[PDB]
């Protein structure tokens, strides 16, 4: 009922749940059972990660539900995830979008962005970014794209179980005309329109934990 991923690269699933893994280098491993317990831990020394479970397509009505029981510093843990419209012309930013729903962080990733909006969902207050990446690394392959952020007002604490309702932030980003492009395919080059909670760490000064559980 489990994976072990250890290579510098790999996505899949493990039973129902899908995830992505990725490093430029060193040990940093995550571990992913079926019934969505995860447990990522890091090298300490610098090099970069990306991973996580999540579901290989977003859905719009989602519930993401998950606890985090360690969290030593990951640079941020975020809802993570992508859409794709592959009939869109490739030099509207909108074509293809990478999406953000922070969680918890070390610094703040959605600086750069174009602030949107505040709202409340679950509880509680986020507040909305829109960045742009010129030329840089996506699901379908080195291109110009939006990023839409959701960042919360206080960081979301361990030991707790918490709950992304993903239609809210769906709705808000909409709400000042930041559109989704198809969340349900493969039509990019490189990987589906996934969807995770992803735990990054960049350029780690010590070695690290996160751990917990995802479902929906």
């Known amino acids: 009922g489990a994976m072990v991923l250890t290579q510098t690269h ?8 899908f995830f992505t893994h990725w490093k430029d280098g060193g040990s940093t ?3 992913l059972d079926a019934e969505g317990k995860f447990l990522v831990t890091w090298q300490g020394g610098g090099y970069n990660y990306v991973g996580g479970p999540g579901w290989h397509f977003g859905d719009k009505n989602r519930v993401i539900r998950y606890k ?5 510093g990951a640079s941020y843990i975020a809802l993570y995830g992508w859409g ?7 030099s509207d930013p909108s074509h ?4 953000y729903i ?24 986020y507040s909305t970014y829109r960045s742009i990446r010129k030329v840089k690394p996506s699901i379908n392959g080195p291109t110009t794209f939006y ?13 707790k179980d918490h709950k992304i309702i993903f239609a809210d932030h769906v709705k808000a980003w909409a709400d000042t005309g930041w559109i989704l492009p198809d969340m349900n395919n493969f039509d990019a080059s490189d990987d589906p329109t996934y969807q995770v909670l992803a735990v990054e760490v ?9 751990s917990g559980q995802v479902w929906d």
Do not use: C
């Open 84 to 90: 794709y419209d592959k009939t869109m012309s490739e």
């Open 68 to 72: 985090l029981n360690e969290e030593t």
């Open 10 to 17: 790999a996505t899949g699933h493990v039973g129902d749940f």
């Open 102 to 125: 922070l969680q918890r962080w070390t610094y703040d990733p959605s600086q750069d962005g174009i602030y949107g909006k505040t709202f409340v969902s679950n509880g509680i207050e």
């Open 147 to 159: 990023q839409y952020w959701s960042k919360p007002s206080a960081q979301q604490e361990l030991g």
């Open 202 to 210: 960049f350029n780690p000064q010590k070695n690290g934990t996160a």
């Open 29 to 31: 491993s995550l571990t």
């Open 96 to 99: 293809l979008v990478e999406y």
